[PDB]
């Protein structure tokens, strides 16, 4: 139903123009709105448009910064985000209203980041199974992915072949302003010395791909 983009990373004080296209339910037959969620937080309503022309509403927390409109020929909802601050970092979602009370449908969600940090790809620092990170028949091996300010880093093992025993953690924003992520896999200790494990780290906005050997 709702597909969206137009987010990305901007410096504080700057702006981003977010939008969402509708396909299925007629755009022009429903009221539409924007909801945001900061990483690690619950939902916050930002703004929205009543069914009909104009009649635009905003949350107090976004007044003076956020402006909305809808294009009924393009079947697209827009959010103009100006003079942004770090507290505006969130995934924004487009949603279709039900009457005046409920959000019946939701888009996929677009990441909007406001930060002084520049785009930076990750460095990868393997967490070896060694002889000390292994106990009996069970070994723990993994990689620490760090110092990459953009969050959408995808990590898989052995080029997608190893999913079994693989656990990854949500990225965590550090005090430096950069993010870090843990990716570990539990494997038989019997595989050590025979199977090399490869951590395949893919950071989309920085065009960074890192392949590390963990043994």
């Amino acid at each position: 139903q709702l597909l969206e983009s137009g987010g990305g990373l901007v410096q504080p004080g700057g702006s981003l123009r977010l939008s969402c296209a509708a396909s299925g339910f007629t755009f022009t037959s429903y009221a539409m709105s924007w909801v945001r969620q900061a990483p690690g937080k619950g939902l916050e309503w930002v703004s929205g448009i009543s069914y009909g022309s104009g009649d635009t509403y905003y949350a107090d927390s976004v007044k003076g910064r956020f402006t909305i409109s809808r294009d009924n020929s393009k079947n697209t909802l827009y959010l103009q985000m100006n003079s942004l601050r770090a507290e505006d970092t969130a995934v924004y979602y487009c949603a279709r209203s039900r009457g005046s009370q409920t959000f019946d449908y939701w888009g996929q969600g677009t990441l909007v980041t406001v930060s002084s940090a520049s785009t930076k790809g990750p460095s990868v620092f393997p967490l070896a199974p060694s002889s000390k990170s292994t106990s009996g028949g069970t070994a723990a091996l993994g990689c620490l992915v760090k110092d990459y300010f953009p969050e959408p880093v995808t990590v898989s093992w052995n080029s997608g072949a190893l999913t079994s025993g693989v656990h990854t953690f949500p990225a965590v924003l550090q005090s430096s302003g950069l993010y870090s992520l843990s990716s570990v896999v539990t494997v038989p200790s019997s595989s050590l010395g025979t199977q090399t494990y490869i951590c395949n780290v893919n950071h989309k906005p920085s065009n960074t791909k890192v392949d590390k050997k963990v043994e």
Binding site: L43, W45, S123
Partner: protein, 209 residues
């Protein structure tokens, strides 16, 4: 303006879930409940706390009146474990609550604990970190205490926890101690004490550079 509770709800697969949303002030109107999984947009569960949304299993039922409402799910499947949210229309604004996390109940499982010393690359780069990994444990009540030369550390570590994962059947936790190269090298023994419900006593794992 409304708050939700229990902060965390823990139910065995097949058990009934009760979730509440309560008055802080009076906002008399029916609120709706939504659920969310990480990496996904929230989904509507009910069309207000007296109804059910299209596509939602008929286990989920909203109920209540005035300013105080609940969501009752007659029985949960492993796929109905999500964070539940409340939406209240106030004057003209749409206001969201904090949400209640609902997790799968299972028995208590102590973590397997592993300590990973810093990589040579981190040290060449001028930094260091030590990672304490807790695998396959349940519930998320583990407390991971970093020590250096038996001195308790504080304010210099991060924590991240996975969702309860079905193949693991529990949680994993990653606790990272951040040291400059200099702090790592000045000290000799690194250790971490893990307190958990499944342990007869906190377990300490350790290593010397």
């Amino acid at each position: 303006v409304l708050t939700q509770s229990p902060a965390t709800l823990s139910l065995s697969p097949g058990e009934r879930a009760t979730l509440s949303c309560r008055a802080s002030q009076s906002v008399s109107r029916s609120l709706a409940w939504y659920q969310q999984k990480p990496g996904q947009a929230p989904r509507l569960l009910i069309y207000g706390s007296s109804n059910r949304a299209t596509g939602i299993p008929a286990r989920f039922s909203g109920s209540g009146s005035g300013t105080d409402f609940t969501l009752t799910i007659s029985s949960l499947e492993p796929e109905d474990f999500a964070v539940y949210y409340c939406q209240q229309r106030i004057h003209t604004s749409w206001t969201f609550g904090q949400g209640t996390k609902v997790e799968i109940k299972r028995t208590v499982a102590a973590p397997s604990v592993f300590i990973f010393p810093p990589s040579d690359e981190q040290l060449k780069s001028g930094t260091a970190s030590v990672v304490c990994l807790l695998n396959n444990f349940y519930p998320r009540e583990a407390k991971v205490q970093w020590k250096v030369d038996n001195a308790l550390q504080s304010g210099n570590s991060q924590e991240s926890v996975t969702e309860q994962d079905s193949k693991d059947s529990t949680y994993s936790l990653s606790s990272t101690l951040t040291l400059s190269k200099a702090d790592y090298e000045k000290h000799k023994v690194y250790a971490c004490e893990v307190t958990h419900q499944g342990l007869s006593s906190p377990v300490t794992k350790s290593f010397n550079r």
